[PDB]
Amino acid sequence: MPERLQVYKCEVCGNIVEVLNGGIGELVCCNQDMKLMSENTVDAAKEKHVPVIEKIDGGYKVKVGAVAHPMEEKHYIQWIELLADDKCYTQFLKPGQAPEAVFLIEAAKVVARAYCNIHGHWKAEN
Amino acid sequence: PERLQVYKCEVCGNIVEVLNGGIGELVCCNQDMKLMSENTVDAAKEKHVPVIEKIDGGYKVKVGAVAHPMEEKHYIQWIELLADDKCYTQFLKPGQAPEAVFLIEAAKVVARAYCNIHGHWKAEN
Numbered sequence A: 001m002p003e004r005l006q007v008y009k010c011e012v013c014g015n016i017v018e019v020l021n022g023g024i025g026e027l028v029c030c031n032q033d034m035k036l037m038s039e040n041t042v043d044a045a046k047e048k049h050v051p052v053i054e055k056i057d058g059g060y061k062v063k064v065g066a067v068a069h070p071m072e073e074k075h076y077i078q079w080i081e082l083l084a085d086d087k088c089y090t091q092f093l094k095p096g097q098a099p100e101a102v103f104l105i106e107a108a109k110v111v112a113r114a115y116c117n118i119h120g121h122w123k124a125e126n
Numbered sequence B: 001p002e003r004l005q006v007y008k009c010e011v012c013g014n015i016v017e018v019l020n021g022g023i024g025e026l027v028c029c030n031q032d033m034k035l036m037s038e039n040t041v042d043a044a045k046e047k048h049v050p051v052i053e054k055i056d057g058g059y060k061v062k063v064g065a066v067a068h069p070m071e072e073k074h075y076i077q078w079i080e081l082l083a084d085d086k087c088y089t090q091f092l093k094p095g096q097a098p099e100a101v102f103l104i105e106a107a108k109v110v111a112r113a114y115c116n117i118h119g120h121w122k123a124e125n
């Protein structure tokens, strides 16, 4: 049963969606259950995938990760998301760009998430 | 589906937003999820079309020209601001004012809002 903020992927066609409103029905695509992309579950280099959160004037800077993650055509961070109270800010990225995002927001406690097309969903919090 | 589209299961109420497009049809409760196209539901536009106000360092968005209800069974579930490759979402709840403030640097933006009863709505500057 889907819950707000969960990210699901169809392993067949590649559709990836985020839940805005939950419910009882299971998400399906290409004749199979969409996969719940649970954070920090994939066996990949943590130093390149776990977001690093830096407090800045008026907000936060998030970089993926402690060591810059590749931003190649076949391997890159597709987006970085910042979660704070009832806010969900997303910055989509492209190969060639730096694996980082800046968010102007007033929130003491935040959760940063990032998604690698190959290595999945990752998160960190301050 | 395409990035940013919002789909709803008319049977159980699941609503999702596309982060990565693909060719497959999203399904829930044995039927294709419905694409919630903006400004298509027959509803009072003065209460659903987002009104974008430019402020120093960002934008203030209100739904709508006339404040939309924010009751337990009829309210604006979220307001979203689309700018460049950014998608900022502010979830709301009954009792709150149907408005949101986004600090961002962008001359052109698209504001969207979703009413649990009247669907998806948008406006731009």
Ligand SMILES: [Ca+2]
Residues within 6 Å of the ligand: A018, A088, A090, B017, B087, B089
């Ligand atoms: Ca979002």
Ligand SMILES: [Fe+2]
Residues within 6 Å of the ligand: A044, A049, A069, A075, A076, A116, A117, A118, A119
């Ligand atoms: Fe990776």
Ligand SMILES: [Fe+2]
Residues within 6 Å of the ligand: B043, B048, B068, B074, B075, B115, B116, B117, B118
């Ligand atoms: Fe409404």
Ligand SMILES: [Fe+3]
Residues within 6 Å of the ligand: A023, A024, A025, A026, B009, B010, B011, B012, B013, B014, B028, B029
């Ligand atoms: Fe359903």
Ligand SMILES: [Fe+3]
Residues within 6 Å of the ligand: A010, A011, A012, A013, A014, A015, A029, A030, B022, B023, B024, B025
């Ligand atoms: Fe699919």
